[PDB]
Design a protein around this ligand. Structure first.
Ligand SMILES: [Zn+2]
Ligand SMILES: [Zn+2]
Lengths: 186, 76
């Protein structure tokens, strides 16, 4: 009954998000959150009858500070996803003490995911605020701003609106579906 | 010659390359065509991650070979 469109009028397919995922993520990375360290994860799943289902939350090998996190062994992540035929549907990460928003770095990261899958989503958890948000770039205009960007500085701003929250009912729908958590860390 | 770069999102990218091209050349081509900067790309062929200063011929990548693209993830 509910069909979503980008800013340029392209159809977005629905992504079914397990209700438990946000909470389970917070629990699984809680140790880090406690040491004021950020953590990221990959939202993995399958395409069935023109809709995507998130089935796996994958915690990759990574490094972190109180305000950054990054993967360090993407080959191990590829091997897991390839063996299990899991698509990359988006990503999730914490802002242990900051508000819920997409940073410059966050947008540069997400742009590439969203170029590769128009439906891709970025989930940002702000546990110290008990807030969270599901974001994507504006398409095409936000994607264009970030693709053409050549500004240095981890915190550089961009001209114009670049991103938005996914709408409610949306292309993302939160459903009572099962979830597997895969921790590729030591 | 044409090679393919298969993502983890159900997309296949077609590139025009020569055997003599380096991996960093190939990542630049991906950026030109697809808008992904080279520093976010990791390319895998035959189970191994490709290193920037080597050539396609160093890994026996030939006409119509398929490489795989996996992206880094950075929050910041
Ligand atoms: Zn920028
Ligand atoms: Zn962030």
């Amino acid at each position: 009954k509910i069909h979503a469109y980008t800013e340029g009028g392209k159809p977005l397919r629905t992504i079914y998000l397990p209700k438990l995922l946000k909470k389970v993520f917070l629990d699984v990375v809680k140790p880090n959150t406690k040491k004021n360290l950020a953590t990221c994860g990959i939202l993995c799943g399958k395409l069935r009858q023109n809709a995507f289902f998130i089935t796996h939350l994958v915690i990759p090998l990574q490094e972190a500070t109180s305000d950054t996190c990054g993967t360090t062994d993407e080959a191990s992540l590829f091997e897991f996803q390839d063996k299990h035929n899991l698509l990359t549907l988006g990503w999730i990460h914490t802002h242990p003490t900051q508000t819920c928003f997409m940073s410059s770095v966050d947008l540069h990261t997400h742009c590439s995911y969203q170029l590769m899958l128009p439906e891709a989503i970025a989930i940002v958890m702000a546990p110290s605020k008990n807030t969270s948000g599901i974001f994507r770039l504006l398409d095409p205009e936000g994607l264009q701003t970030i693709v053409k960007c050549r500004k240095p500085g981890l915190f550089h701003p961009h001209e114009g609106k670049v991103y938005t929250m996914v709408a409610q009912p949306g292309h993302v729908r939160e459903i009572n579906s099962k979830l597997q958590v895969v921790d590729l860390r030591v | 010659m044409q090679i393919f770069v298969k993502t983890l999102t159900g997309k296949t990218i077609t590139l025009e390359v020569e055997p003599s091209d380096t991996i960093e050349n190939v990542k630049a081509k991906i950026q030109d065509k697809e808008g992904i900067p080279p520093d976010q790309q990791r390319l895998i062929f035959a189970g191994k991650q490709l290193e920037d200063g080597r050539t396609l011929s160093d890994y026996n990548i030939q006409k119509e070979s398929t490489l795989h693209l996996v992206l880094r993830l950075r929050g910041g």
